[model samples]
Target: GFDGAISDDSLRQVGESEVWVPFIHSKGNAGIGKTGGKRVDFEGLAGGIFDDERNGVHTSGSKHFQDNFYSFVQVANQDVWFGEWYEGKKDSEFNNRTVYYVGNDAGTTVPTSGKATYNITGINKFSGANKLSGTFNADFGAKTLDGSINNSNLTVSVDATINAATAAFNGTAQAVQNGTTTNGASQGHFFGANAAGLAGIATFTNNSDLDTAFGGEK
Candidate 1:
């Protein structure tokens, strides 16, 4: 878990109404492989909305995963058009499950392959500003794995600056199988930092490597 602070204005400004507005700028990392040791890396950005109320809390956001190199640009573009909103209890958990559509084409563009459903469990907290953590599991998609964060932080203030405020994630995934045994593991780390009123950036690095068998075969 990382340590940081969340702004108070973003959490206090919410009224007792169903106000739906964008929330955070998100980036994702994914990879796919086959038994023969073929692999692909993916990254992208998406927009999120926060629906706050006096009692019932609802927060949802979507992101378009692109390439690691282009994730910042994509998020910047989307952030300019989408505005995030805040309201209700700042620390609420969501146990919602939804299907995510993924593509397969590996050209410098977003994938257009297939779709998969992930059991997404998330929670938001507003101690200093806003802190969020969650886990997503895709069972039947091109990938199979469970990734989660322990205590990720998020800071969004009226100055139009958003920061991840130091967060960490650890997970495992099966990229390919051989003779009924999975052969690949995907793991990584996430770190974010930014000044006030400036767009924050989250850096994700792949800490997992291919299996010894695959490496030797290569």
Candidate 2:
């Protein structure tokens, strides 16, 4: 959406953030950012997936909703990952949520870590940075997965490739839960290091009759 609202230089510097929630830890506490002075911090179960509020605040120029929203994260000695923020309503239970892939960055190696796998997929892909590597974060509040299957085996994997140069993600996922989910096209906005024109959104659909959408620091 960087049509004419900003220049090319400001384009690469644009970023965003918001109050994120994760499904697994369904905690009824505060979510998203926790800012103090010119510094802001993002940590916890759901919000911990991605990062925001690095070293600066505020957008290009504004006065009202001109508060700060960050997505381009810079961890001193950490890995880079992806965050899919969404809202799911199973029957009547509804709330904001986020599924994240943690601990993979710039081909930087770690002792060991896991990413957040929102659902089951056979082919996953990322579109930023150089290496897409990490483990899946847990959902049942367990530190480690038992690798066990329930009445149904909801197991899947995806191939993710992030083209950092272009800030585009290309991926495919397959599922076999009760039947299957449609192979859908990807739609989202890229986040960068404290830019002025940024907006983040994510969507999901069942091959048949449903579509779910989520918004964030686009």
Candidate 3:
């Protein structure tokens, strides 16, 4: 008989040598049975079944089943990557740790479905150079996604598109995973001139900025 809200911090610990958190909240209610003459009665007998059915005879111990739950995390920072981590629950734990990268496989034009590309343009103002125009080709890599930037922070909007190929057996009612596969590729080329001749360089940055910014604000 457990009912309440659980926080991520209470369930997760980041960094090296982390401890795994147990996902099970409780073992459910206990059960009892009584017998009389030709009739038998049960109390707290794991309740009803298909059509008002009850447990009868000798049914070993109380039934134990895993609870179905989910968690949603919204990130507001600009340096950290937003992803899910297993707190050593059930089959979620592995001997080795793994990291996942996200991208869009759907069209980049207005965030459509199936393979898209984007043209990223921005202006860089360094202490030496007032402002430099920059343009690059970015491929989101097939998913429903959109991006924007304000004050040096970038925001990516993500959504899942369901199709015959994207649908999967999610253990719960044959759910469609919606989001694109992690197997994505991206390439970008930037064009910027060194107006101050200070060897201005064009480089690609990872998505960590978003993660760091979101985690810091939190």
Against the reference, the lDDT scores of all candidates come to 0.20, 0.24, 0.18
For 1-218, candidate 2 gives per-residue lDDT tens digits of: 12010011111111122323354222222122222212111223323433222222111111113322222222222222233222232222222332322221123211122322322111111112211122222222222221111123332323333343433333443333446544432322223332101111122344311121111221
Which one is best on TM-score? 2
**Judged by lDDT relative to the true structure, which candidate is superior, 1 or 2?**
2
Q: Judged by lDDT relative to the true structure, which candidate is superior, 2 or 3?
A: 2
Residue-level lDDT of model 1, residues 1-218, one tens digit each, is 21111112222111111222234222222222121332222221222222222211123322222111111111121111111223223233211111111221112111122332222221223222222223333332232324332223321111111112221222333322112323232222112221101111111122111111000000
Model 1 residue runs over 4 Å out of place are 1-77, 80-123, 133-141, 152-218
TM-score of 3: 0.15
Better candidate number, 1 or 3, judged by lDDT: 1
Q: How accurate is candidate 3 locally (lDDT)?
A: 0.18
Residue-level error in angstroms, candidate 3, position 173: 27
- Order of models, best TM-score first: 2, 1, 3
The numbered model that scores best in lDDT is 2
For residues 63-114, write the lDDT of model 3, one tens digit per residue. 2322211111111111111122222231233211111111111211121223
RMSD to the true structure for each prediction, in A, is: 20.1, 15.3, 22.9
TM-score of each candidate structure, all chains considered together? 0.18, 0.28, 0.15
The count of residue-pair clashes in candidate 2 stands at 32
